[PDB]
Structure 1
Amino acid sequence: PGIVELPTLEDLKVQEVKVSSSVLKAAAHHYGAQCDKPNKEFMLCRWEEKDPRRCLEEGKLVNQCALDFFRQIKRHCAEPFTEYWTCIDYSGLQLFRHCRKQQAKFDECVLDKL
């Protein structure tokens, strides 16, 4: 009874974020603080529409905004962030507790630059 409608593959094409989980976790707090508005718009649309097919544009926006955030990180604070995410990636649990020193270095660097 009825026909399901699915968007074409051209509607699902977007520049993916090609960083690993540890890299995402290293900058998770700053990403949440800076990228908050598109994230909240997308998630509110998600629990309001209750349909993945009605929230493609907000997903594209959140991908673009995350890419902009990571481009800023790459432009300004590449090396401290590299050390921080390497340290986070080494641990099996990916604990923030292990190397607070690198986290402090990255935080002070990004506070000085951006």
Structure 2
Amino acid sequence: PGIVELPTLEDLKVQEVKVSSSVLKAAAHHYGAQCDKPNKEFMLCRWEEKDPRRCLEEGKLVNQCALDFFRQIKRHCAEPFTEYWTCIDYSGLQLFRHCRKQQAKFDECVLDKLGWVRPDLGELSKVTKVKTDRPLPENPYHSRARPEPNPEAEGDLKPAKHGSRLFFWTM
């Protein structure tokens, strides 16, 4: 019994970034490097509040920053990125292994056109510290008041009054 509150359709009307999974995979490392702040803030909100109905604005801002990143890569390094993501898309598993020359062209293009460097191995998987300004959810699980603990057992022990007190056994 209650209300399943749901934000109206207007709040979740994001611009809906539209690139295929192969295109996303091609720009994975550079996007993670130069877009880490919105992703990290949004995910910390998601993990702390534990309520996607609450951190929708961070979901907006992450999409805004992703679209800005893709607009920059469109404006500066369109051709190498296009060839690289097409060559990634050809593979069934989308492995970076086969596509290394196009990766080199894309990397040098973004390095000398947008000042970017790909993260080294394992750099993109380190736990980061975010400087979010939202408060800490006091009751993320919405837990009710806990039952009071049972009365604690304490006190000095003396011999049982009149022994066992079990039938004729006096002692």
TM (norm. structure 2) is 0.65
Runs of 4+ with deviation above 6 angstroms? none
Q: What SS does the aligned partner of 2:65 have?
A: helix
Note the C-alpha offset of 1:47.
0.3
In 2, Cα distance between the equivalents of 1:108 and 1:89? 21
- After superposition, the C-alpha distances for 1:21-56 in whole angstroms (9 at most, x for unaligned) are 000000000000000001100000000000011110
Q: What SS does the aligned partner of 2:24 have?
A: helix
Which residue of structure 2 aligns with residue 3 of structure 1?
3
Which residue of structure 1 aligns with residue 157 of structure 2?
none
Q: What SS does the aligned partner of 1:10 have?
A: coil
Note the C-alpha offset of 1:99.
1.5
In 2, Cα distance between the equivalents of 1:30 and 1:99? 16
In 2, Cα distance between the equivalents of 1:77 and 1:71? 10
In 2, Cα distance between the equivalents of 1:11 and 1:68? 20
In 1, Cα distance between the equivalents of 2:78 and 2:14? 24
- Work out the number of aligned pairs and report it: 113
Note the C-alpha offset of 1:3.
1.1
> What is the RMSD computed on CA atoms of the aligned residues?
8.7
In 2, Cα distance between the equivalents of 1:81 and 1:50? 36
- After superposition, the C-alpha distances for 1:35-83 in whole angstroms (9 at most, x for unaligned) are 0001100000000000011110000000000000000000000000000
Q: What SS does the aligned partner of 1:52 have?
A: coil
Looking at both structures, which has the greater relative contact order when contacts are Cα pairs under 8 Å and sequence separation is at least 6?
Answer: 1
TM (norm. structure 1) is 0.97
